[PDB]
């Protein structure tokens, strides 16, 4: 048992017609002080992956290193490593639920809501979440945190089951995704501007955008907003 | 419980879901929680649903001889001083959680207030359970200079995402129009999406198949003549 | 919340952010936080939103059944009202207020009441969460006499920095400038601040 | 839960009722609450079901062991102390246990209770659950080591009605066990809603009930 | 411990065409032990008719409070009260006591007398009103009641067929409650004739 | 200070007159007319707007007042007097009746209510 | 002052009450009288915590005696338990609450008939052919479930109560030091001294 | 303080017939007042004509159904590819959960299939691992609103014949699987009314001697 | 499983342990034997916790049996009382201590004395003329302070016994259904059968 | 405490005020929190002094046999080896420890390693209780590529703030210059510092 102490918030994601989209704010927040704002939250694995990470910073650093270490595990006796016996979304999302509940089974948890994103090998799109207590689900739009309350119903109005995600583009997903980041700016006191947005397409592969910043924010009408009830000037 | 508040043009809309509960029960499937304070003057409530009554039923009941004394007609800011006010001597203990909006001859208003008894202004506010899908919603699509139809459309969405998303909304749609030189217009069950399908079977039983021990004729007239 | 209000050759300037939270809920974002309970005396409010509304009003009420009376009341006066409130009502209270003024015979005053309600006159003041991150800057960078031109930079520059900070802090800048010509409302957005 | 056994004459009685209850909400009206241990030993069973299931499983694992190696039968004494001492190893650590180990053996008719502290009693007559003191009050007053087969398997039937009437957590059905020297026989499950107008009508019993 | 769940009951209203039922158990206990089963819950005031469960002494004060006040209600307004105002009559009386309640779980039934329109409402523990269309449950199997009522109800059911819609959702309701049965009564009310019916039910 | 006049202003004399009452019966007479009908459809109520002086605004002045939605009240004799009464029959249809029972009261009960506040005056010290 | 028995039979009403008083780990007294007389026909019995409950029984005996006086009438038992549960229920509401259980025992003189009143500490009132509290109907009930009948006499009832005592003194952890047995019929109130 | 348990709502149910049987389960999964998903698999088919629902706490759920389906995958190397029969499995899964007697699966589990007479076979378990074979059982958050209604619609439960009058019971005739399915729905459907928890979807699984088949059904998203 | 005493009389020692068991609110058993044999000479009572009682008593039963085995000799009171002390002494610092007091009464057939041994839970052994557990002495020891000689027979042993049982039958709260007597002298250890 | 870490154009600086105390009481007024674990590797400490001090002992036995076996380590492995010991041991420490050192190759580095035992690269660090007053003011005033000079001023102004607003920090400003020229101590009285 421990609290988490250097935390990341909200990581919200995807499904689209050819592929999967994630994306997660670059703060490292310290209680209510906004610590560090160059954190990247977004980890690829491969070419193929991208496992999205919330909740405590030293914790994702471990996890981190857990990946970075089954890469290379892999490659091990390996001459198809970098082809048909490749690290798969699959693979590397029920080994995380392995360690998680395993944590959680001993009294001492990872303190994460993790979110893995990619395309399997037969190009279906693969998006499943994982938390500190071992619970699973897979769900056309995911997101942790702020963004489950937040995010999930502006990106379930584009996809709102299975049958819709044929229907979606990348551009309509990915505008979605852009949206709810700054939904989440406007409302959520632990969130930055400053976000990565990761996009695992079974045609482009794996596009990694870092240093994006929410844009086109309405503030203008707070001029005329005056006092709290009867005050005038 | 999701309930919005909206400015548009030339007045403001407030809506809410219909959906009360009690735990993970629901007790009622098409509560009514848009309340009048005056005719002009409509609040939607939040949090424990007898105080969101209570409260706005005496404010309501004061607001109307206030009225009375004055020959003026009831203004919003009088609503709210008058909640606030209430609710703040009570230090929380009156859940009552309100979005308060109406016309007067000030113009066009809109308000929230806690339990606590404090207040805010805004064009745009959402409170109770399903506030946070609500509000996402207002921050995607809300403008400055709204007309009446937009306004109506941005609410019920909003509402809409609510009931959707949150386990605590549910059920129908509730709308109330309040715009500038006009009745204000009630629009109970504006949508209603959620209409239960057709069961499998009809449950209907043979008269006979309760067993019955004493029968008796009760007596709910009075007294009788002669 | 982050808070100031800086005294000038002219007068005095309040200053505030626009972020009220409930605890990692943003409830509004374009929150007006410098209120008025006279003309040309003014406060910042930090703490309970319902006791500071509720005080504020309270003083409101008494400032003018002051002028009614006495006529215009000092900042000194609005300060011991303030006072009066808070430290009889300590126990029951949550409520840190900085108090400004303009007077034509003191010109610009400041006062900050803090929890307890005691009372500390002082050429400038800063309050709320977001304040203890801009106790180096604010000290470093204040001088007496600035200009308002100076004095709108100094306080633009130091709620920045706290918005940057501080979690509980944020939206825009809002302030209000008490002078002899009169009251003037000033807003400044996060694309103008955070660049700074 | 109602459960009771007695020794008579030719045996011992075994009566339990049937109902499960998860706060007010009856989540069960028909469990077993007497195992099978074997066909010469029957364990009945309140507190937590899963101790009681699993325990007393395991107990028929170790008395057919038992009569593997030695050649002949367990004896009550001895079955209802390997489980009590299964009980004391896990000793303060939570577990709920009542029942009644019920057969027949060389001494004649055994009745041993066991619970989770340990504890190990024979006895003529037992009761546990929460409807055990109406059942006691059937029991003491009409108890004899006189008693026919028949009139022994009424008297545990009625006191159980007796407990399942007056106590909330207590209902559904009666089960009748009867344990002889060549084994237990089965007496059938009885609903207590008709046995309680049956017993009514016939008895005279239960006046101040409306039927 | 829970006030509410100590003496167990229930209480279920319905509506029909041109007419209400109103039923209840017969049980009041202490927690466990079953004390009493002709533990009537259901009471009317003229053509009024209103169901409590909950506290059983709350239950007992409340009738005697609204026993009391629709007498001097009747002798000043010269009538007898209608169901809807004593909804509101009920609701007000509750609220009274927000801060130190009465634990009741009151449910209305009746006529209006003018209209014909058949009425039901049910009543938190502190005056909220739940004015269904179709039916109203209360007491320590309301989440059973839920779920019979919700299947086996239907609009626009006669007298007679109602009567026994009403009956199967409170007998099986109460035979998955521990502190629910121990008898029942049903009332099958129109416009101006009320029969009442005591059903035979399991004793357990 | 203190109200020291616990005592009854209005007595019985020895040939069983109140006095005070017949004394305000009196002031009523001098009072400008007033009268009601009453129809199969309806009731109407009205009186003469006596203006004191034609510099003042009579519309200001209001002699028949609305008590509630359904409730209409005309007087004769003093006009302060009707005035705050008037302020408290609207206060009592609710305090006494719509606080409780959700509706407004029938017109008997809130003449009821209105004529037991001023038999008070009629008693009380 | 933990048990006390009631029940109804024909033409009487009879009520059972221990005899111990505790003080601590001592048994004080083995022949205290748990009950007050009310007025001719009507007798009152009690259980709960110390001192409450032979102040509330005094209090309810002085009201009634009050009006006995005043009307030169003597209320029925309905009448009696009625005020008496009036003010157990205003009693529970109270800054401290008057913990007393009680058993009312009268013979109706204007319908001739024994009636039993079982009213708890929250105000909860039952009429009943036999009654008891806390946990004395536990070893009880299940007795009087099978034997009693309605009409019974008065020496039947009292030997289905010593069935009652017996089952008792055997199943209960506690020494009770037996009863004291008092018979309320329609010539008043009288004690049973060999029991 | 950590809590290593949480409630992923869920609704369960599992009718035996003469020779079939049906596992039914809402397919939303959510925690506190927010939906997870409105299609996440409850019910699954475990080999050997078996299906299986843990109910409750998720990571346990699937944790427990995932060591069950091991457990059957050795038993048919340790014992000559035997089949596992329901009995026999259901004694194994009290094996499994009272292994955790001390840090218990959070989940309320039932089983379904045929016995070895190739009658409808239901198996119901504690979270400790006291389990029974039973006619009808409705598990997790609705199973309060359900089981009053089967045991009035499937055992006619307070029904008489008329004419009677409590004399003669209404007799207890065998219902198809068109029959159950009909009172799954209904269950279900007036379920999602009345609890918040419940709605998106149903699953059904059906066994017969021909194996396992599936039925969905949308259910209201509110 | 409360009340045990013993007496050390002229040529004999005399234990008397009260016969109830009671789980929850219910006597289960008026007939219970709350003491072992540990050899032909020593006889042990003992109280306590539930379970632990009979588990510690027989735990210490077998290892005399053994050591009686073993040395084809019987151990005098004071080894086995030395024995036993040493054992509840381990317990009491141990994970979960065994919640049990005991009395030892034995006839040392070498020094051809009757000796008495009093040993509370924690290992807190005295040797004395007559003792108790729990609050039984606290009813008792002022009447066994009184009327006790070291010259007593075992007649007067037991007729002083008497007393003492009636005195804890009058004043204690609870029901402890009697005591079952037994006698340990040079002839070994019986039972007195009528009580 | 206050601590800070600064890297400038020709290495790193660590900085640090010398007050340790016992609730209100000055336990030690000249404390050094400058800590060697390697010739050019050292850190700044807060938190429990037993667990940093036992911490760095720690990294200093396995720098030292690092160092017999595979030469000079790099300030990166430094930094490894002390979040190793913080983040598994994370349960029973209270460790808020900044890591600065100067390798040829490198140059000046600085890692951050607070409470739960992650790690952070930065330009510069600031850490202890006396830090957060200081936030602002070290985010406007620093600069990359710095002079030593320079960096000695940005160091004794930021930590004359953080003494002069937190309690818990006071004494002497204590400084490490890391350069390729060596290592240099360097101390800053009272007198000095407080006119600044
Ligand atoms: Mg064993
Ligand atoms: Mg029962
Ligand atoms: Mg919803
Ligand atoms: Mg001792
Ligand atoms: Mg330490
Ligand atoms: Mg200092």
Same mark, same amino acid.
């Not at chain 4, 299931?53 to 395991?58: G, I, P, S």
């Given at each position: 048992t421990q609290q988490?102490?250097?935390?990341?918030?909200?990581?919200?994601?995807?499904?689209?017609?050819?592929?999967?989209?994630?994306?997660?704010?670059?703060?490292?927040?310290?209680?209510?002080?906004?610590?560090?704002?160059?954190?990247?939250?977004?980890?690829?694995?491969?070419?193929?992956?991208?496992?999205?990470?919330?909740?405590?910073?030293?914790?994702?650093?471990?996890?981190?290193?857990?990946?970075?270490?089954?890469?290379?595990?892999?490659?091990?006796?390996?001459?198809?490593?970098?082809?048909?016996?490749?690290?798969?979304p699959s693979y590397i999302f029920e080994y995380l639920a392995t360690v998680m509940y395993q944590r959680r089974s001993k009294m001492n948890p990872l303190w994460n809501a993790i979110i893995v994103a990619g395309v399997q090998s037969n190009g279906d799109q693969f998006l499943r979440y994982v938390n500190l207590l071992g619970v699973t689900y897979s769900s056309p739009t995911l997101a942790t945190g702020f963004g489950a309350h937040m995010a999930n119903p502006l990106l379930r109005k584009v996809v709102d089951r299975e049958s819709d995600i044929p229907k979606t583009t990348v551009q309509v997903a990915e505008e979605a995704i852009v949206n709810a980041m700054r939904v989440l700016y406007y409302r959520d006191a632990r969130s930055s501007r400053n976000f990565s947005l990761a996009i695992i397409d079974k045609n482009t592969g794996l596009t990694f955008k870092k240093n994006l910043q929410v844009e086109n924010m309405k503030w203008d009408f707070a001029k005329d907003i005056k006092g709290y009830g009867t005050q005038k000037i | 419980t999701t309930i919005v508040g909206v400015k548009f043009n030339?007045?403001?809309?407030?809506?809410?879901?219909?959906?009360?509960?009690?735990?993970?029960?629901?007790?009622?499937?098409?509560?009514?929680?848009?309340?009048?304070?005056?005719?002009?003057?409509?609040?939607?409530?939040?949090?424990?649903?007898?105080?969101?009554?209570?409260?706005? $039923?005496?404010?309501?009941?004061?607001?109307?001889?206030?009225?009375?004394?004055?020959?003026?007609?009831?203004?919003?800011?009088?609503?709210?001083?008058?909640?606030?006010?209430?609710?703040?001597?009570? $230090?929380?203990?009156?859940?009552?959680?309100?979005?308060?909006?109406?016309?007067?001859?000030?113009?066009?208003?809109?308000?929230?207030?806690?339990?606590?008894?404090?207040?805010?202004?805004?064009?745009?506010?959402?409170?109770?359970?399903?506030?946070?899908?609500?509000?996402?919603?207002?921050?995607?699509?809300?403008?400055?200079?709204?007309?009446?139809?937009?306004?109506?459309?941005?609410?019920?969405?909003?509402?809409?995402?609510?009931?959707?998303?949150?386990?605590?909304?549910?059920?129908?749609?509730?709308?109330?129009?309040?715009?500038?030189?006009?009745?204000?217009?009630?629009?109970?069950?504006?949508?209603?999406?959620?209409?239960?399908?057709?069961? $499998?079977?009809?449950?209907?039983?043979?008269?006979?198949?309760?067993?019955?021990?004493?029968?008796?004729?009760?007596?709910?007239?009075?007294? $009788?003549?002669? | 919340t982050s808070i100031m209000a800086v005294t000038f050759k002219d007068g005095v300037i309040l200053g505030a952010d626009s972020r009220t939270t409930t605890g990692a809920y943003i409830a509004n974002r374009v929150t007006d936080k410098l209120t008025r309970v006279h003309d040309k005396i003014w406060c910042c409010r930090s703490g309970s939103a319902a006791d500071t509304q509720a005080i504020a009003d309270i003083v409101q009420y008494h400032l003018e059944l002051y002028t009614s009376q006495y006529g215009t009341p000092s900042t000194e006066t609005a300060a011991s009202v303030f006072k009066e409130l808070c430290y009889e009502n300590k126990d029951n209270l949550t409520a840190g207020i900085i108090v400004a003024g303009y007077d034509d015979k003191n010109k610009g005053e400041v006062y900050t009441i803090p929890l307890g309600g005691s009372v500390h006159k002082l050429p400038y003041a800063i309050a709320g969460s977001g304040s203890t991150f801009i106790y180096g800057y604010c000290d470093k960078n204040f001088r007496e006499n600035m200009s308002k031109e100076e004095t709108v930079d100094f306080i633009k520059h130091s709620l920045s920095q706290a918005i940057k900070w501080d979690g509980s802090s944020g939206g825009v800048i809002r302030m209000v400038v008490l002078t002899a010509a009169g009251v003037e409302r000033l807003i400044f957005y996060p694309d103008e601040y955070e660049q700074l | 839960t109602t459960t009771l056994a007695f020794k008579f004459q030719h045996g011992v009685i075994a009566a339990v009722d049937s109902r499960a209850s998860a706060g007010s909400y009856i989540s069960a009206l028909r469990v077993n609450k007497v195992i099978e241990i074997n066909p010469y030993?029957?364990?009945?069973?309140?507190?937590?079901?899963?101790?009681?299931?699993?325990?007393?499983?395991?107990?028929?694992?170790?008395?057919?062991?038992?009569?593997?190696?030695?050649?002949?039968? #367990?004896?009550?004494?001895?079955?209802?102390?390997?489980?009590?001492?299964?009980?004391?190893?896990?000793?303060?650590?939570?577990?709920?246990?009542?029942?009644? #180990?019920?057969?027949?053996?060389?001494?004649?008719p055994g009745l041993y209770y066991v619970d989770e502290h340990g504890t190990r009693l024979s006895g003529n007559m037992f009761s546990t659950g929460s409807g055990n003191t109406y059942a006691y009050g059937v029991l003491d007053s009409n108890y004899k080591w006189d008693l026919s087969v028949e009139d022994a398997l009424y008297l545990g039937k009625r006191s159980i009605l007796a407990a399942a009437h007056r106590d909330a957590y207590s209902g559904g059905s009666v089960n009748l066990y009867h344990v002889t020297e060549d084994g237990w026989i089965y007496h059938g499950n009885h609903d207590v809603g008709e046995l309680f107008w049956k017993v009514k009508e016939e008895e005279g019993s239960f006046n101040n009930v409306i039927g | 411990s829970d006030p509410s769940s100590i003496n167990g009951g229930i209480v279920v209203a319905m509506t029909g065409k041109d007419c209400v039922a109103i039923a209840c158990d017969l049980r009041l206990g202490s927690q466990s032990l079953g004390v009493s089963n002709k533990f009537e819950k259901i009471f009317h005031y003229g053509h009024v008719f209103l169901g409590i469960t909950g506290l059983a002494t709350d239950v007992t004060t409340l009738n005697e409070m609204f026993r009391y006040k629709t007498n001097l209600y009747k002798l000043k307004e010269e009538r007898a009260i209608e169901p809807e105002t004593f909804t509101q009559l009920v609701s007000s009386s509750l609220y009274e006591r927000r801060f130190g309640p009465y634990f009741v779980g009151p449910v209305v039934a009746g006529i209006n007398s003018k209209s014909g329109k058949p009425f039901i409402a049910g009543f938190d523990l502190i005056g909220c009103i739940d004015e269904a269309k179709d039916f109203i449950v209360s007491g320590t199997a309301s989440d059973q009641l839920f779920g019979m009522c919700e299947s086996l109800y239907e609009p626009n059911l006669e007298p007679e067929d109602l009567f026994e819609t009403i009956s199967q959702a409170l007998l099986n309701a109460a035979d998955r409650d521990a502190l629910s049965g121990w008898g029942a009564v049903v009332y099958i009310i129109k416009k101006d004739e009320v029969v009442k019916r005591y059903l035979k039910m399991r004793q357990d | 200070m203190t109200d020291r006049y616990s005592f009854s202003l209005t007595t019985f004399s020895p040939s069983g007159k109140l006095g005070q009452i017949d004394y305000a019966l009196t002031a009523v007479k001098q009072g400008v007319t007033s009268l009601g009908i009453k129809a199969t459809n309806g009731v109407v109520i009205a009186t003469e707007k006596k203006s004191s002086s034609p510099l003042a605004m009579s519309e200001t002045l209001s002699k028949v007042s609305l008590l509630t939605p359904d409730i209409g009240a005309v007087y004769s004799g003093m006009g302060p007097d009707y005035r705050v009464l008037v302020d408290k029959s609207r206060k009592v249809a609710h305090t006494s009746y719509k606080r409780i029972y959700g509706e407004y009261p029938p017109t008997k009960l809130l003449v009821s209510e209105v004529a037991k506040i001023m038999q008070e005056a009629t008693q009380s010290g | 002052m933990d048990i006390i028995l009631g029940i109804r039979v024909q033409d009487s009403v009879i009520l059972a009450s221990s005899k111990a008083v505790t003080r601590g780990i001592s048994v004080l007294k083995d022949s205290d009288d748990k009950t007050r007389q009310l007025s001719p026909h009507t007798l009152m019995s009690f259980a709960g915590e110390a001192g409450d409950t032979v102040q509330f029984a005094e209090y309810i005996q002085a009201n009634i005696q009050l009006y006995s006086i005043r009307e030169d009438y003597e209320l029925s038992p309905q009448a009696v338990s009625s005020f008496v549960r009036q003010e157990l229920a205003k009693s529970i509401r109270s800054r401290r609450p008057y913990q007393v259980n009680v058993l009312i025992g009268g013979y109706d003189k204007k319908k001739n008939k024994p009636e039993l009143y079982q009213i708890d500490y929250l105000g909860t009132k039952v009429e009943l052919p036999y009654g008891a509290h806390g946990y004395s109907g536990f070893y009880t009930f299940s007795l009087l479930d099978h034997h009693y009948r309605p009409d019974m006499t008065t020496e039947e009832g009292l030997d289905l109560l010593k069935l009652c005592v017996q089952e008792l003194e055997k199943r209960m952890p506690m020494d009770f030091k037996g009863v004291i047995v008092k018979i309320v019929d329609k010539d008043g109130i009288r004690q049973v001294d060999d029991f | 303080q950590f809590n290593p348990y949480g409630d992923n709502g869920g609704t369960i149910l599992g009718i035996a017939g003469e020779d079939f049987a049906v596992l039914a389960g809402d397919t939303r999964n959510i925690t506190d007042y927010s939906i997870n998903s409105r299609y996440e698999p409850k019910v699954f088919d475990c080999g050997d004509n078996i299906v299986m629902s843990?109910?409750?706490?998720?990571?346990?759920?699937?944790?427990?159904?995932?060591?069950?389906?091991?457990?059957?995958?050795?038993?048919?190397?340790?014992?000559?590819? @035997? @089949?596992?029969?329901?009995?026999?499995?259901?004694?194994?899964?009290?094996?499994?959960?009272?292994?955790?007697?001390?840090?218990?699966?959070?989940?309320?589990?039932?089983?379904?299939?045929?016995?070895?007479?190739?009658?409808?076979?239901?198996?119901?378990?504690?979270?400790?691992?006291?389990?029974?074979?039973?006619?009808?059982?409705?598990?997790?958050?609705?199973?309060?609103?359900?089981?009053?209604?089967?045991?009035?619609?499937?055992?006619?439960?307070?029904?008489?014949?008329?004419?009677?009058?409590?004399?003669?019971?209404?007799?207890?005739?065998?219902?198809?699987?068109?029959?159950?399915?009909?009172?799954?729905?209904?269950?279900?459907?007036?379920?999602?009314?009345?609890?918040?928890?419940?709605?998106?979807?149903?699953?059904?699984?059906?066994?017969?001697?021909?194996?396992?088949? @599936?039925?969905?059904?949308?259910?209201?998203?509110?």
């Open positions: 988490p102490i250097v935390t990341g918030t909200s990581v919200i994601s995807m499904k689209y017609d050819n592929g999967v989209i994630i994306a997660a704010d670059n703060l490292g927040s310290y209680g209510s002080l906004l610590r560090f704002n160059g954190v990247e939250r977004l980890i690829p694995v491969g070419d193929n992956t991208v496992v999205g990470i919330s909740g405590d910073i030293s914790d994702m650093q471990h996890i981190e290193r857990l990946l970075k270490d089954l890469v290379t595990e892999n490659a091990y006796d390996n001459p198809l490593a970098d082809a048909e016996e490749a690290l798969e | 030339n007045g403001v809309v407030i809506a809410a879901d219909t959906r009360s509960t009690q735990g993970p029960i629901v007790a009622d499937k098409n509560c009514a929680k848009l309340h009048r304070i005056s005719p002009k003057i409509w609040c939607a409530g939040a949090g424990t649903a007898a105080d969101t009554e209570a409260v706005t $039923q005496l404010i309501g009941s004061n607001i109307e001889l206030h009225s009375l004394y004055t020959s003026r007609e009831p203004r919003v800011v009088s609503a709210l001083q008058m909640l606030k006010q209430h609710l703040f001597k009570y $230090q929380g203990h009156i859940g009552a959680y309100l979005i308060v909006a109406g016309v007067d001859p000030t113009g066009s208003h809109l308000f929230s207030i806690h339990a606590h008894g404090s207040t805010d202004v805004g064009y745009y506010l959402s409170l109770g359970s399903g506030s946070l899908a609500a509000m996402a919603v207002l921050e995607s699509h809300w403008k400055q200079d709204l007309t009446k139809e937009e306004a109506i459309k941005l609410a019920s969405d909003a509402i809409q995402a609510g009931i959707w998303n949150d386990l605590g909304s549910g059920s129908n749609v509730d709308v109330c129009v309040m715009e500038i030189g006009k009745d204000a217009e009630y629009l109970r069950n504006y949508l209603t999406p959620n209409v239960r399908e057709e069961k $499998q079977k009809s449950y209907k039983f043979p008269r006979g198949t309760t067993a019955v021990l004493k029968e008796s004729i009760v007596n709910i007239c009075d007294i $009788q003549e002669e | - | 030993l029957l364990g009945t069973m309140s507190g937590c079901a899963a101790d009681c299931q699993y325990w007393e499983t395991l107990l028929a694992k170790e008395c057919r062991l038992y009569y593997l190696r030695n050649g002949e039968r #367990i004896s009550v004494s001895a079955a209802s102390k390997l489980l009590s001492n299964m009980m004391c190893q896990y000793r303060g650590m939570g577990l709920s246990m009542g029942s009644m #180990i019920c057969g027949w053996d060389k001494k004649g | - | - | - | 843990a109910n409750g706490f998720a990571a346990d759920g699937d944790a427990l159904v995932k060591r069950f389906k091991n457990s059957v995958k050795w038993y048919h190397f340790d014992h000559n590819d @035997k @089949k596992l029969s329901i009995n026999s499995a259901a004694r194994n899964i009290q094996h499994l959960l009272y292994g955790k007697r001390f840090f218990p699966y959070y989940v309320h589990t039932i089983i379904a299939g045929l016995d070895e007479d190739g009658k409808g076979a239901v198996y119901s378990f504690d979270p400790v691992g006291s389990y029974e074979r039973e006619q009808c059982r409705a598990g997790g958050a609705a199973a309060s609103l359900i089981m009053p209604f089967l045991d009035n619609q499937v055992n006619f439960k307070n029904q008489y014949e008329p004419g009677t009058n409590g004399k003669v019971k209404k007799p207890l005739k065998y219902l198809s699987v068109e029959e159950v399915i009909k009172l799954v729905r209904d269950s279900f459907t007036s379920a999602t009314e009345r609890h918040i928890q419940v709605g998106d979807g149903l699953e059904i699984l059906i066994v017969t001697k021909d194996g396992v088949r @599936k039925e969905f059904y949308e259910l209201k998203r509110d």
